[PDB]
Amino acid sequence: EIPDGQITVGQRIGSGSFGTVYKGKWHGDVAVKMLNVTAPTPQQLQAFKNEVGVLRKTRHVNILLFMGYSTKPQLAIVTQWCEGSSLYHHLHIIETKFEMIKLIDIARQTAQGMDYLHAKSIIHRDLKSNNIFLHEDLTVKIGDFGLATVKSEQLSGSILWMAPEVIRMQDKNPYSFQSDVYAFGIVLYELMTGQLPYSNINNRDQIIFMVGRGYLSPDLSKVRSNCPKAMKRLMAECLKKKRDERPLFPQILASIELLARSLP
């Protein structure tokens, strides 16, 4: 489970909400990520060991496999490189124009991966379009899932995909299956508007406070005109402020597939 200096490290790629990733060499094309958390209390390290254990086993075609963790150079995690661009890059940097069937498809495969993860009782906890890659522009690979111990509670990264209860940080643990379902709804918002939520608000603390207290939610009028009605209803169901009202991925997958059948 724990490698020891065997690994090679390469070009700096960039840094996210809980680590810095570089292209590496644990074998052909691995992707290694030095975690922000670096002084692990032994109580924290134990939970990390067991979480990596649960993560080693996860194999699914819409999921990027997690290979191991190295502590000795620096506490790092190691995962497969992904030649494709992330979904955030396609939508929001290069503005890839897709047609509705492929957007629905991307939604479907994401839902397949999330349903596999919830089937194995893994809360993603960091679902963003930043963490969905389009492999060779065809398959979907979800990454950066699990690892609850490394993310410590303070928020970090982008607020945009966090549910109200995640933003409040008032429950024992606010992250649940339905938190993932909320994040996934923001990703559906992304797919169906080509746009991030709250494009009209440039005050980050305003967004945090107002979606925290249920005063602000995505503007669903900005969904594009060829968006199926069923898809828009599903989006709205995923984004309910109260977590108990959101659906679980088994019925989300059902919904999306039965939707995708009845297309032109």
Binding site: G157, L160, D205, M210
Partner: protein, 309 residues
């Protein structure tokens, strides 16, 4: 004043000799610190020989929007003032936006505050004057707000100078920064948090909240317990709900001037309309009390870090 005209001009001349900024022309000297999204380095510009500070922002954004940001930062070339950090240039290269500004060997008041424990009211007087004068210059002559007033945004140097930096000249930059990089605390007015735009009122609140903190050496939301006030956390949603729902911070009873307590109180009232304005603060009694005073701010700063000047 005589001396602002002198020093400002000198900056403009050795800015005239800088020319066009290119990445290969900078050598890294040392690290000045990092924020939520930016990193700052003390660098040497070889063709001119100047030493400056280079902020580097790494954003994942449409190239159209990045070129918009660069165009809008170009406005900094005309925001020249003794209360505004000197600006040399801004450009894009190797995935990074670079903002080149004059180096301030005092650093920010955020760090100074860590090194001094508390900052005396005497010194906060001169600081308040510098910030009010800067916000005023921004508003009167460029119709632009700061939008991010806080001690990490107030820079000082060993020549006694106090200057503002990181003010909102590029809205695209703000809205980019908004889509990532959560922080852990906030200096955001209660009117802005609820989506109200009452202009320059937002920056006055922020300054007030700054003052309290540097006066006591603690970010004042929430107020300290009676046992922790003796010595003279919250996730960010709780902080914001506290700023919105509960009454504003306050200075301690006797340890501070009555005029200073009144100044911060008028800065911190939660109604943006009855809160003090720039022209009112400018003539507040603590402000005149402090402008009459003759302090050795350069020497005080140096004593708080290093050698006297």
């Amino acid at each position: 004043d005589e001396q602002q005209r002198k020093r400002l001009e000198a900056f403009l001349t050795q800015k005239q000799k800088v020319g066009e900024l290119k990445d290969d022309d900078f050598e890294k000297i040392s690290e000045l610190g990092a924020g939520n999204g930016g990193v700052v380095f003390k660098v040497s510009h070889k063709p001119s020989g100047l030493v400056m500070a280079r902020k580097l922002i790494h954003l994942e954004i449409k190239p159209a929007i990045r070129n918009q940001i660069i165009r809008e930062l170009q406005v900094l070339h005309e925001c020249n003032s003794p209360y505004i950090v000197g600006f040399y240039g801004a450009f894009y290269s190797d995935g990074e936006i670079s903002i080149c500004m004059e180096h301030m060997d005092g650093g920010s008041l955020d760090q100074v505050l860590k090194k001094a424990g508390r900052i005396p009211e005497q010194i906060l007087g001169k600081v308040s004057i510098a910030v009010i004068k800067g916000l005023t210059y921004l508003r009167e002559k460029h119709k632009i707000m700061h939008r991010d007033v806080k001690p990490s945004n107030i820079l000082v140097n060993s020549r006694g100078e106090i200057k503002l930096c990181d003010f909102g000249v590029s809205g695209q930059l703000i809205d980019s920064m908004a889509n990532s990089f959560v922080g852990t605390r906030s200096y955001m007015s209660p009117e802005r948090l609820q989506g109200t735009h009452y202009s320059v009122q937002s920056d006055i609140w922020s300054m007030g909240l700054s003052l309290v903190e540097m006066a006591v050496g603690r970010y004042p939301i929430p107020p300290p317990d009676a046992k922790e006030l003796e010595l003279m956390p919250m996730a960010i949603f709780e902080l914001l709900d506290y700023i919105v729902n509960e009454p504003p911070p306050k200075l301690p009873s006797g340890v501070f001037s009555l005029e200073f307590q009144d100044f911060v109180n008028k800065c911190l009232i939660k109604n943006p309309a009855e809160r003090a304005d720039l022209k009112q603060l400018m003539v507040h009694a603590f402000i005149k009390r402090s402008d009459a005073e003759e302090v050795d701010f350069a020497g005080w700063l140096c004593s708080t870090i290093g050698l006297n000047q």
